[PDB]
Amino acid sequence: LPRVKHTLVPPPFAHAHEQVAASGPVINEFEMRIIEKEVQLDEDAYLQAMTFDGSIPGPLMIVHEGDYVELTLINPPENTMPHNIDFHAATGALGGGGLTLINPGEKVVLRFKATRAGAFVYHCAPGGPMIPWHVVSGMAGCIMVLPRDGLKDHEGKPVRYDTVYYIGESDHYIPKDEDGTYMRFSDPSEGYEDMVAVMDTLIPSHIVFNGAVGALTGEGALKAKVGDNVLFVHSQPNRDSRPHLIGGHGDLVWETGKFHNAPERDLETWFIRGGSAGAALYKFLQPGVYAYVNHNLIEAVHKGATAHVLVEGEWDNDLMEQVVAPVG
């Protein structure tokens, strides 16, 4: 089979690809390096993170149904922990976790057949208590397996996007001092016992898009134009989310993320089950600022789950008009 070597790009962007496969099955080659580093979640909040390829989430991989995925995974000698990878897209050996455990200084190559279309989570799962801990330290991303003929709607009609954005939502459990301030550690292992105690409450300290509070706002705001069909692929590897585009809708939504199921239409808010990825297409109709949020608004605003989309184009007064301006 042809081999295609991909250069991954950091989230929320996606590597070059075609929606309709330009060929028959290929072997898709990807490589990622695991990076353990402290990351700043918020102004005075830091996470002893563990990442695929230096980003939270890990980068988006895009292939077609019936392709193979050949991943080279590298755990550099400077890392402290063993790591591996479980693709929810894959069949067998705990998603590949059983075949990919690598120590610092080792690398491994896994091949699987992408037999099922949809957006899927991938995450680290080295075993026992390590599983939740590695995930909530940042080790999860998404692979999207498109149908060979591209996406289809609830009636089997071909559907096309202009842009995909990968929104990786992640919950984190940063320990606190009695006064509410966040603790700092020298490395992941040092912070482990304190982190577990927070994990046990099931209350995240932060819930973020793209690895940090405000990462996709201000200078990181997403961009589009009136008329653009934008696919928002949304992963949550550990906890539920309820995405909502403020000012918009989900035109076609696969909330369970699997493309051969019929999408729902006209949604205000949809539901990403923890341990899954979903996808929503929207055609922008009005210019201006939109917020893409987890619609538990405490999670959106206090915890960090808010992105902005800045949209250019002409305003349509038939859809909405301020008839009487604030007056009094």
Add this chain to the structure above:
Amino acid sequence: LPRVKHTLVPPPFAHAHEQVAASGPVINEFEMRIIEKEVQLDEDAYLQAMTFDGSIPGPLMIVHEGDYVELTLINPPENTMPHNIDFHAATGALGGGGLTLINPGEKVVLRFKATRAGAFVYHCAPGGPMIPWHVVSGMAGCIMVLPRDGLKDHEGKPVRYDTVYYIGESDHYIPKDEDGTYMRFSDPSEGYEDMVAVMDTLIPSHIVFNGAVGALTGEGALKAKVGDNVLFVHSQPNRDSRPHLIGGHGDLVWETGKFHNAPERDLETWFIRGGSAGAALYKFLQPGVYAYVNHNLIEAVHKGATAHVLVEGEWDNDLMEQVVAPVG
């Protein structure tokens, strides 16, 4: 276009309307006044509330797909805060939030086209940390945009209800003294910092229907007769819910609340995503008392999420019969 002026009625009731539109598109005119007042959630629990039209939830608006909605929103001079409105039914300007910010003593008129059929949340969203806070202080309601030809089932067959009840479920975060008792404040702003600390735990002190524990029980119990097709429209603007009618089912359920999607049948329990409204139709078959509950039973019983429905009519022993009475 014809203009139709509506008189809103408090929840769980609905203003006069027709399921099948008796005309082509109209401009629907509504008016609401924002009322800031302390409300009693429970025996020794009070909320510094902020409300649309004096009720929690805000009143239900009912229009047809392709109509316009023209809302006059009034923030009386006695209020302390700026307020606005985001309709999830609307397209643009953050659902209208960007065009409706009004200070105490001001009013505003917004028009939008109700382009999509379904039950939708509306809520206050004045910006930043104000967003979750105004919502969890009571500022959310629902607008139902019916298809012009009325509801249709999973097979496109016309479906009709005898009664709609609007169940507005709301989570609240009342601060507590060390001994578990609830704190009281002079106004919303005074209670703000203490409320935020509760919000951060993501654990509501109360989760209520119609603004208070027991509001829809005893004297407030809902009523129906055997044979009645009752539509239960259920909103939750901030947190997930799992409605269940104890003793009944959802005959047709749109849990994501958007009427052009096929409903599911025969449900025991359905799922309202935080930041959305859903709808369930049930035809009553047995007389007696029913409980409509959020089926996290701690949320139902300890937090306040229980309504009763009292149903009159004849008992059917073929469906259920006590064969041997408690004996021993």
Add this chain to the structure above:
Amino acid sequence: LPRVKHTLVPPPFAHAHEQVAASGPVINEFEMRIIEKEVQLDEDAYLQAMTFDGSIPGPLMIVHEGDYVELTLINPPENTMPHNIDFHAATGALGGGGLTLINPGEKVVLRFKATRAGAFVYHCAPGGPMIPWHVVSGMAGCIMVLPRDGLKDHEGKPVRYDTVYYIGESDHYIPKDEDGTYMRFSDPSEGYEDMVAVMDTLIPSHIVFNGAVGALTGEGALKAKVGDNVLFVHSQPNRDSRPHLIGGHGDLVWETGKFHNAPERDLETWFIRGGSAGAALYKFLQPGVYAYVNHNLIEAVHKGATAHVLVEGEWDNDLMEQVVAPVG
């Protein structure tokens, strides 16, 4: 009508039955005895439990749509509490709760018509605060009402399982001393006030399958062979869950659990609403160990929500292959 007397078997197993009804409607006779006993959830964690038939969950009942269910429920004189039963499968009298309240030393016989196909929760619901408390002490199980002609897929094609496993997931709220250790009590009533305080936080101390941490792992691991179509019926009577088979998928999933609705395909993770049962069919394609988990991995690993499935058969390198073994 013919009467059929069933011998229940403990979970995760199911009593003898046929998927396609070998006859017209029958009256299905079941009997269960309520057992109040302390149970060990985990190494140093015990629950003052209240059970149907001595198991958590209560045993699975299997009947066909249009059958009757006649249940004899027995509350032995050694018990301390009144108990009853609410079948979500049933119509009227709070699912039967209104007709089945029995004191220690009493028994009752309830008949209902199983008019709706699907997996349904049954649980104890003796009234008021007793409701959540009896459920979170273990009093819930599942009844599966199969269509008379067996299961059908999203296209109406007949579908057949080789094995059903009933996974009863239950959240528990065991009180703790200041040092994090769990408290012990002489009986359920003694532990009540302390348990309520934990219930109020909505944070379970344990979330288990089959009544205990590790119950379905090691010696209790589930078993299958490559090629087996296994139906996983999953109940959660009080709290949401997000089941995921690590290394596999849901081939056909009814997450709301009602068999006349079309199932979704190829799911990675699905969603069981608190107060419901859902069902997922998977055909095993690879041998080895699988984990069936609630995919909030903290709930899976720290709280107890993990089962293992051990699968025998031949490995398929086309689906997955370790191309380069860990090396360095």
